[PDB]
Amino acid sequence: GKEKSHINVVVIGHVDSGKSTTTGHLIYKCGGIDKRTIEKFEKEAAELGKGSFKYAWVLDKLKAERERGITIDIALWKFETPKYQVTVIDAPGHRDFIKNMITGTSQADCAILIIAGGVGEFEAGISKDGQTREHALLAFTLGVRQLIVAVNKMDSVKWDESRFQEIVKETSNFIKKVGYNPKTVPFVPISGWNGDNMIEATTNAPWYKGWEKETKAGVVKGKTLLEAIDAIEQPSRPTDKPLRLPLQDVYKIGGIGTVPVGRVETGVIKPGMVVTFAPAGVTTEVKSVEMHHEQLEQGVPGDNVGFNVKNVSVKEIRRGNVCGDAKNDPPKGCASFNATVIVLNHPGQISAGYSPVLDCHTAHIACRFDELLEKNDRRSGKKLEDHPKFLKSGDAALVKFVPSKPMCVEAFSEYPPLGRFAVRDMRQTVAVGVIKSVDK
Amino acid sequence: PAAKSIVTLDVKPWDDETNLEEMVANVKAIEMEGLTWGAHQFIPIGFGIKKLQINCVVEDDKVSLDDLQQSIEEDEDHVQSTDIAAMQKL
Ligand SMILES: [Mg+2]
């Protein structure tokens, strides 16, 4: 039982791709989620014959049990690989997941695109207007640079090499248009149901020599999807960056005082540090830090911590404000910020003056699109025109934003979690933004 | 069948004295076509405060999570805020 590093993975794909069975299989055989329910169905399966059972059958029963609302475990799913503890999201098709994908905690280190290999299922999955492409575009825009492609349902096409090759060609085109470099992407033929190439190599494809990907140090090869996941590159965590901790809630506890709560996005928080809260600019000492049941010596990137501070009323700091270190690039409110905005598909056009609500870290504030400064080629960033008169679906543009209320944001290059945002309107996320400059 | 998602919501109280049983009873009393309430637990977050962590399964086309969060938040006497702890496709 070796010590593991932590990574986040998001699984995307069309409704017929079989991505839930595929993700479910990995969690079942490499993790420990809803195991008492799994055990109940493994025993029940004896009824099908004389004892043997398929993992897919158990997953089907687990799904129905979850639908009834009687399973016990929460929706935070994890599984292990030789090197990692993986937190995985089988992306929901729910439209409210888009905002959650942009501002939620745990942004992905790698996206796994599941592709149905069948004849009419593959084409349906790569439609330009499909939810799958939107998810891929969002991941790319948010900096998810690693991608793994799994071509599922290979049994349905009799593990035909030509079909796999054509699918790889067409999928490479699909992802290249989004922005990914296919040479850095492993393409794994699998059967989520039968288990081929999931954890163990398939015996149904003698032509299969394995997957490969180019990395900065050389070429990495493997056979299975689990190997591809274990091959994900170790991303650098922001432990040494200045502290940034967006507030989620603020409590007034008898006998303790003010206790803000939030996720440490960058840097580390420790008792004894002197912190500043922005947009207000209030400064104070951190008295103690707690998480779950433990008192901490430090809260590191990813920890959702409570901390007690003196001489700050709950009325002067609130959700959306950002806590940072007063002696290491303290956070500041801004007069405005310029960001690259990617307009998603929606029933409207954007003109200067537009003032929708933006969700950035824990802040929820209406911000004016004060000026449309440029229109750009999305993938390269090249300026196409100065001062476009309007933006339509698909456009990438540099926009100057003016917040309607005091707001603390950061450039994405410096503090990623405080530099990406979702634009809300018409009951959906209509645009995603990446902050490029801030006027503090 | 209709597309669904399983969601875990964190419902936060005002302080360490908030009546948590009332808070969850109010959440569970919310009825929406396509919404199924699941398991819940009260989880310590530090300093004696506990948040409600509750599962629900929703039909994507019928249940707005934005609306559900807003509805839960109407119980101002018990609820300070709600957040999505995690969500998955089913
Ligand atoms: Mg399905």
UniProtKB/Swiss-Prot annotation, chain A:
The keyword Ubl conjugation applies. The eukaryotic elongation factor 1 complex (eEF1) is probably a heterohexamer. Two trimeric complexes, each composed of eEF1A (TEF1 or TEF2), eEF1Balpha (EFB1) and eEF1Bgamma (CAM1 or TEF4), are probably dimerized via the eF1Bgamma subunits. Interacts with eEF1Balpha; the interaction is direct. Interacts with GCN2 (via C-terminus); this interaction is direct, occurs in amino acid-repleted cells, may be stabilized in a ribosome-dependent manner, reduces GCN2-mediated eIF-2-alpha phosphorylation and is lost in amino acid-starved cells and by uncharged tRNAs. Interacts with CEX1. One of its GO terms (biological process) is cellular response to amino acid starvation. This is Elongation factor 1-alpha. Residues 4-239 form the tr-type G domain. S-thiolated in response to oxidative stress, probably inhibiting the protein and causing a reduction in protein synthesis. Glutaminylated at Glu-44. An L-glutamine is linked to Glu-44 via the alpha amino group. This glutaminylation is yeast-specific and not essential for the normal functions of eEF1A. However, eEF1A glutaminylation slightly reduced growth under antibiotic-induced translational stress conditions. Changing D155E: Increases KM for GTP to 10.3 mM and reduces translation fidelity. Inhibited by narciclasine. Residues 69-73 are annotated as: G2. Pathway: Protein biosynthesis; polypeptide chain elongation. Present with 827 molecules/cell in log phase SD medium. Residues 152-155 are annotated as: G4. The modification Phosphothreonine is found at T71, T81, T258, T429. Residues 191-193 are annotated as: G5.
From Swiss-Prot, chain B:
Belongs to the EF-1-beta/EF-1-delta family. The C-terminus (pos. 119-205) exhibits guanine nucleotide exchange activity. Catalytic subunit of the guanine nucleotide exchange factor (GEF) (eEF1B subcomplex) of the eukaryotic elongation factor 1 complex (eEF1). Stimulates the exchange of GDP for GTP on elongation factor 1A (eEF1A), probably by displacing GDP from the nucleotide binding pocket in eEF1A. The 30-fold higher concentration of GTP compared to GDP in cells favors the formation of eEF1A-GTP, which rapidly forms a ternary complex with aminoacyl-tRNA that in turn displaces eEF1B from the complex. The chain holds residues 117 to 206 of 206 of the full protein. The lineage of its organism: Eukaryota, Fungi, Dikarya, Ascomycota, Saccharomycotina. The eukaryotic elongation factor 1 complex (eEF1) is probably a heterohexamer. Two trimeric complexes, each composed of eEF1A (TEF1 or TEF2), eEF1Balpha (EFB1) and eEF1Bgamma (CAM1 or TEF4), are probably dimerized via the eF1Bgamma subunits. eEF1Balpha interacts directly with eEF1A. eEF1Balpha and eEF1Bgamma form the eEF1B subcomplex with the GEF activity. S-thiolated in response to oxidative stress, probably inhibiting the protein and causing a reduction in protein synthesis. This is Elongation factor 1-beta.
